[model samples]
Target: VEIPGGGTEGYHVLRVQENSPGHRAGLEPFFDFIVSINGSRLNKDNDTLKDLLKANVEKPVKMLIYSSKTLELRETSVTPSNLWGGQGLLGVSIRFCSFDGANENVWHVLEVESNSPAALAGLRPHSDYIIGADTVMNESEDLFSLIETHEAKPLKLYVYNTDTDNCREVIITPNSAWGGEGSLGCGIGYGYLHRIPTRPFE
Candidate 1:
């Protein structure tokens, strides 16, 4: 991805329930990535394929899948139905995967509280991604260590807001004076689901 705070290209296969449509259709938990569904290229955004699946329940939908091992996209099929798992139609928790295998790249402003320091910095919930706090934001420890080291002081940060695909520096001061939980007063999410997302073309 060329844009700032951008991430890996496909919908990450986080977990596919055992004996479910995902598993039956040969979806490996972490190795598989969904590139397209029924021939339409999957846009990396929320709720990409719900209505389409519902429209053709119990029918095998052709999907284009990618494997980390093969590094190639291949054709596969998954029939979405509650009759199999009695749970979600696909029986999977799919997320977007970031590159950088060993290094956790980006962290998201998972939740911003009212009147909190982050809240004042325009950290909207599900909208802001903390790309770098004091370093490249490559490791989660960097942010935590910086916060503790510079307690009660503000740190210049690079945040990318997905709502507008804009990148800018924002200040975040860590202090217990606000009387909120944790130094951040909000949850900082890391891992697959927290990867910086591309603002899909709507």
Candidate 2:
């Protein structure tokens, strides 16, 4: 395939605290991305968001938000205030996110069980991202059928991490007798919030 680049990554809404400015504006917890605030695009880092809010305390600030769920953009306004008794000005956790649509097929690893296939494979919960498998996994069915068919065979999973910012190979064998609910013994998160955000290494 061909390689392409240059996509916008808005400010990712990691979390939204209740009764805050962000919550009052109805910003979706993890699905909303703040692309612009007060006409300044948040294309690079969190500085713009921080500085904007810091400068406009108790003032109405216009924001352009993008939804990963709806794949659409909307405009809204927020007035940050200190009287809300919240952690931050907006009481929302924000990070830079990938908007290049490269996150469609990615899955986040959640709740790795002890002595299970996933744990034995060195999969870390809340930090790992699963993309594909070894030897050309082209579709979702390719991964599912392979895991379903080869129960005892050693399977190579293409794992990605955000904390370390690296992608590596993991060998895990699916076994029915692994003493867990499922063969993998882990939760697979396919939501937009679970996607790996593309950020600068610089």
The C-alpha lDDT values of all candidates are: 0.69, 0.75
lDDT of 2 by residue, 169-189 (tens): 799998878987657888878
- Cα error, candidate 1, residue 160 (Å): 0.7
lDDT at position 3, candidate 2: 13
**Residue 38 of model 1: what lDDT?**
81
Model 2 spans with C-alpha error above 4 angstroms: 1-7, 106-175, 178-202
Candidate 1 residue spans exceeding 4 A from truth: 1-103
Error of 2 at 117 (Å): 13
Error of model 1, residue 183, in angstroms: 1.5
What lDDT, from 0 to 1, does candidate 2 have?
Answer: 0.75
